[PDB]
Symmetry: D2
């Protein structure tokens, strides 16, 4: 069971933390006494998040601005963040490329850009982070969506990127389990959350209820700190069970017995 003391003095990176859920994550970490380093494109927005973190009582707080479209930035961001904190205990991968809802009709560049920003960068970050995470037996939060488990019309590029995160990171978890690598990987599956981006983008099109971002952010922390495989925050107590896919869990357990683990 979660205690906020579990983040006291912990060294945590938060991406996409200028606004929305990621900003709320940073705020909760600050109140728990964590060291944070926040990132996003907007310097202006990030300065303001850092000031507020300090006031809430973070152990320390710093920002680094850049685009996660740029793989070299992602790699160098992590090195400098670990240098600022003297290590890393938790990597929270929360950023995402904004894409307007439309029926797909040939926007290949957006398919490319969505995969770069929402997927390849997450992998780059995690690779860059992995030595420090192994040293501290730390944790990664991979922030995804109900739309990275099922499909929804009007968001094909985004959903493909989120499916990919499941395929990659769940594979990596399985490998870490067999190899006795004590770095936890928590895939966070979120429903509609009441950030600004969401409410505007869905206005007039998607009518589901939205859940509060402040709560959403807290549950992401809690699940990742408890080293959960998955964390569901989706507006219903029943939906996590419909998304949990027990058939997949069965097939994975049985298929594992087919490997020659000695070789």
């Amino acid at each position: 069971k979660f205690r906020p003391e579990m983040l006291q003095g912990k060294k945590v990176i938060v991406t996409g933390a200028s606004k929305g859920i990621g900003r709320e994550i940073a705020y909760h970490l600050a109140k728990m006494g964590a060291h944070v380093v926040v990132t996003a494109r907007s310097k202006e927005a990030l300065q303001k998040v850092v000031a507020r973190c300090l006031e809430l009582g973070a152990a320390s707080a710093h920002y680094i601005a850049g685009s996660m479209e740029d793989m070299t930035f992602a790699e160098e961001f992590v090195a400098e963040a670990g240098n600022l904190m003297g290590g890393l205990d938790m990597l929270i991968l929360n950023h995402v490329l904004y894409n307007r809802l439309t029926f797909f009709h040939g926007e290949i560049d957006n398919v490319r850009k969505s995969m770069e920003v929402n997927f390849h960068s997450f992998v780059v970050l995690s690779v860059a982070a992995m030595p420090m995470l192994m040293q501290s037996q730390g944790s990664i939060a991979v922030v995804s969506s109900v739309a990275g488990k099922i499909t929804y019309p009007l968001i094909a590029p985004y959903s493909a990127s989120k499916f990919a995160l499941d395929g990659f990171f769940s594979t990596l978890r399985s490998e870490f389990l067999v190899n006795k690598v004590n770095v936890s990987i928590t895939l966070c599956i979120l429903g509609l959350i009441d950030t600004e981006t969401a409410i505007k983008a869905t206005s007039g099109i998607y009518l589901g209820p939205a859940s509060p971002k402040e709560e959403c952010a807290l549950e992401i922390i809690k699940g990742t700190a408890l080293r959960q495989d998955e964390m569901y925050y989706v507006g219903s107590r029943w939906v996590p069970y419909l998304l949990g896919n027990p058939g997949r869990k069965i097939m994975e357990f049985l298929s594992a017995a087919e490997y020659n683990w000695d070789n």
Copy 2:
């Protein structure tokens, strides 16, 4: 009920058709009397396939050699294949990057190349083909894997790209259904198949049973000509129900109430 006459005089691209399942797909289409354009990188191997297709009874058979890592090739390949046949009725997307079963050790370049060859090129080919396929009320076969519905240790880059196909193409199918677009999309879910690539790549590592490549190829063709949403060929009548994800089907169905469709 499938009849081989359904492919007589039809115009069919097969990618990854120099060997393995792809080659088998090409032979079957030839026996059914289709027009075919095959592709892969190896010009020598494609020629062998084309001569064999002519002998087997193909209406027409041509090849174009190139790499699906190059999105410009992919775009040009379709327009040329379409000029060679005078149109396009079916696009079989079967190619995949050769990989080996090894734990992920941070090989970022391979994640990137896998995603290009296995995923982004499928999208690029589909978009190039879409005009011709709307004209013919045609079909797309998307060749995937059980590893694009559940994860397996030692293949994280491949599984990520395959999961990505499901999120992308399944979303597209749903948009095509609401918009009454007469282009079907069949996600092919394959278990282990006795291609030379799979036998050698699993030897001493993964010891599950394999199914026969010739029948595998015929089942892709059949399920695609019959315009099925999904086609499972996995060595079991039971397993397709544990991969079909009843929970996801329920959520997607219920999701229709959540859109303002008139808008």
Copy 3:
């Protein structure tokens, strides 16, 4: 889509109609202009229901009083009710034995009596009605419970009888589909309803929320009239899917091919 016009002039039996859901079912049918014959053991209560049905607009309304513990009453009841209305279109089997919530302690006599009242009478009633129902291509509603799909502490005798109802009536439906017998059978799965009996019986014991009896009654009517296999009224949009058991549906589908239907 349901229209109340579908029950106008229809000939309907309602059992356990002196209070609770059964009473409400009677009222709703009256408003739609059905003919109703109602039953239970309390004469005075039944006389009040009949009068109110007439006031509300029933084409006709009669009661016959007796105990469904008595299999000869059940049979004779059906014959008299069809005689009163000149036929039968719908059999609503709603009565149940009162049972308090305690741990089972060897009360064998109660296991017996619960099976007589809740199960055997329902079979006997159905058997008596069947000729009339085949003549009208009519319908049976079998009123059951979430406790006829899963188990709950403190109601073992009751649950046993509700489970029997599913095994029996669901087999009968399967036999009727196969034999082109056009009598529909609707298993109604009710969550907690705010009848006086349920409120009293669960008070300080079972604290889950209760749905309104008036709507519950209407939903039984609509689902049965629409000829659904099953009708869930459990106060959740999602729970019906955790109850209706996709695994069972798959198995029943696959097993049907194991029969030698020609024979």
Copy 4:
């Protein structure tokens, strides 16, 4: 991990033990050194089983002949068998009424008689055994079928009675767990088994393969000894997953939390 010495000197009742699975269960217990009392109606068949059990190594073997249609016999049988062995460690409820396959067309007596033999007698036997089983912290095997979890055409009376067993005994188990009563209850879910009765009844109607009775009997004994909630013996490795019903397990878990257990 089961070991056969687990049953050496244990005291076991086997009903329906004159032929079929019940006979094979008696024989396996004998081999393991158990004390057995066997019952069915056929005196002469039970004599043969007893002599053979003694040959195989049974610590002791007795029979009592009688019909489980007779509830008084059932009650007295248990007291007498416990007298004969000086206690009871395991009650294996295996008997069933044979019912010809037929479309249901109003055989109300068969519905009654099947519920008496197949269900009521199991309850009465369990209640009569309960003091001895509480004293030995013993076990009950409730032998059911795939057709006590899903429905099959032509066997409605049988299926109703097996469904009832699940509702009753699974409720009692959940009460025993809460009341810390150490008597285990194992529901045995069997596929088609090659007893002479099954093979003759299904000949030319139901074409599914039948599994061996000898192994079926051993698995019942093993799962019951291991104090499992359910034991599946069915034909396919996948079927226990499909019949396992995770939705029911979830709902039972979450419902249980709605009780005021203090009260």
